[PDB]
């Protein structure tokens, strides 16, 4: 996810006297020329926010060049993708030799290889923009490279889900930390309104585990807007309100938690149970309220960004028509 980062580096100054007379500006220019758009220290670095601390322009001591170096401690805006990250725009550039290459068209430049041994793949062709979910293998940020490296696959609703048992109560500091993700979700929901409703409905129908009756029943829009589909069993709970009144000490997160496929994978909806009524084929993950809340909020952010990027890349019906195999295998695995 796009985030800030603080880096430490030593520059090289070939004209120390000219590099002065404007040190902050020349420093920023050199940092942009060196580190912008290049993987460095387990991150990608998109732009340089500014210089926090810096050294005096020391003259090089071990050579007779007269050059200076200077140490720079600068804050930069970086992108760190993770496993299960949803990239809605991946352009395939290679399909022969059973390697299936790709390239993300999103803000985060990751080049994604897709396994060909799996029968699910080998359906996309060159020049086909199709969403991809990153595998659980960690993104590979080679220093100095112009793009990240990861392995992903064609996204599937993934009916398998996890149940989180919560035995530790939230604290005030942890809730304040979660407020950042709550704000990120709030901006995501705000941006959700600009995208045209019919495209978001079509995409959300496509990437849903179960079947929704021809994208006409109800008007799922979240950002408040209390709607809901499927409703296999039990009542969703609004995680945003729960975290907001968690700051107010008017609630308890103790219990069982899950986000089953019946829930909308984009909505701020979750079940706070006490008996593990869910029929998942896995034992509950005993953890704290912070762990479960962070996991659910990251899932919500990933899905909201996924829907927004899907609406961004396919902004017309010509692209939808062009993708001759993308939209029907996803409806096949339902």
């Amino acid at each position: 996810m796009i985030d800030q980062k603080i880096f430490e580096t030593t520059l090289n100054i070939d004209d120390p006297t000219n590099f002065c007379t404007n040190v902050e500006a020349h420093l920023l220019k050199e940092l942009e020329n060196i580190y912008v758009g290049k993987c460095f220290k387990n991150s990608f670095i998109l732009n340089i926010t500014g210089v926090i601390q810096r050294s005096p322009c020391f003259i090089m001591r071990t050579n007779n060049s007269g050059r200076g170096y200077m140490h720079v401690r600068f804050s930069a805006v970086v992108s760190y993708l993770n496993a299960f990250d949803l990239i809605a725009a991946v352009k395939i550039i290679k399909n022969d030799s059973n390697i299936i290459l790709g390239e993300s068209l999103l803000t985060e430049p990751v080049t994604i290889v897709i396994p060909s041994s799996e029968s699910q793949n080998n359906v996309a062709e060159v020049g086909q923009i199709v969403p991809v979910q990153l595998a659980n293998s960690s993104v590979y940020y080679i220093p100095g490279r112009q793009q990240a490296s990861a392995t992903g696959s064609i996204f599937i609703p993934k009916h398998t889900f996890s149940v989180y048992h919560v035995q530790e109560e939230l604290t005030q500091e942890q809730a304040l930390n979660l407020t950042k993700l709550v704000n990120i979700i709030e901006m995501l929901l705000e941006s959700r309104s600009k995208k045209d409703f019919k495209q978001i409905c079509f995409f959300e129908k496509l990437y849903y585990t179960y079947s929704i009756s021809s994208d006409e029943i109800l008007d799922l829009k979240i950002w408040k807007g209390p709607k809901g589909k499927e409703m296999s069993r039990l009542k969703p709970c609004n995680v945003l309100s729960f975290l907001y009144d968690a700051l107010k000490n008017k609630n308890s997160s103790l219990g069982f938690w899950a986000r089953p496929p019946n829930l909308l994978k984009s909505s701020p909806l979750a079940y706070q149970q006490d008996q593990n009524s869910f029929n998942a084929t896995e034992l509950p993950i005993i953890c704290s309220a912070e762990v479960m809340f962070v996991t659910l909020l990251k899932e919500i952010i990933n899905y909201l960004q996924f829907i927004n990027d899907l609406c961004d890349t396919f902004n017309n019906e010509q692209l939808i028509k062009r993708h001759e195999n993308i939209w029907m295998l996803i409806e096949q695995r339902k």
């Binding site: 580096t9 030593t10 520059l11 090289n12 060196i34 290049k38 090089m60 001591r61 071990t62 050059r67 170096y69 140490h71 100095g144």
Partner: protein
């Protein structure tokens, strides 16, 4: 990019185990061929990934010419382990202070818990310890005999029962030594005796063996 200016402030010396060789090796030597015509044979000791010493080819590893290439080490996975030639005395000292069955120290660590660290192992190995009984597995420590025919062969003397201590057996013995025993004997955690036996030796960069040491 843009490798910034730097100066070396300190140098750390350590025993290089086979894990370090595997991490630092850019290539694995597998063949005995030297040159494939006018070019080094791939996988040989002259392989260009190790650096270039001739104008007739570049490096490959660093894509530099002969002048700008500092050379890069390789790996030779030994089919049988070898003892580190520089630390034969350290192997001998470690063999005489730990039980060859369970790896526990046959010596009393409290006995040497007043000496300086560089001397604890030397004094532990100075004591006889032949015929001592392990308090863990009740085994009898043999007589560690250094063969007089070469600088590396070790002999296990069990009241006349003579058996050769092969580097594989020595590695099995040294791998049972805990880091607690290593520290209590005055050695660094980077000086674990498990690094004294090499299953993957480092073939040096061609920069230090130009086109005899390659024979």
């Amino acid at each position: 990019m843009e490798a910034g200016y730097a100066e070396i402030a300190a140098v750390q010396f350590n025993i290089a185990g086979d894990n370090d060789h595997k991490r630092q090796g850019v290539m694995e030597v597998t063949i005995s061929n030297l040159f494939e015509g006018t070019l080094p044979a791939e996988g040989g000791i002259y392989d260009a990934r190790m650096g270039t010493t001739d104008h007739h080819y570049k490096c490959i590893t660093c894509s530099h010419q002969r002048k700008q290439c500092m050379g890069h080490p390789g790996i030779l996975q030994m089919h049988a382990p070898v003892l580190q030639p520089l630390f034969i005395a350290e192997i001998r000292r470690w063999l005489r202070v730990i039980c060859l069955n369970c790896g526990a120290p046959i010596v009393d660590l409290k006995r040497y818990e007043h000496l300086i660290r560089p001397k604890r192992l030397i004094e532990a190995a100075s004591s006889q310890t032949e015929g001592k009984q392990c308090y863990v597995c009740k085994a009898v420590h043999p007589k560690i005999v250094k063969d007089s025919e070469d600088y590396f062969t070790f002999w296990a003397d069990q009241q006349g029962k003579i058996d050769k201590l092969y580097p594989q057996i020595i590695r099995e013995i040294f791998s049972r030594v805990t880091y607690d025993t290593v520290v209590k004997l005055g050695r660094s955690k980077n000086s674990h005796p498990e690094k004294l036996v090499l299953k993957a030796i480092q073939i040096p960069p061609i920069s230090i063996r130009p086109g005899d040491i390659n024979n």
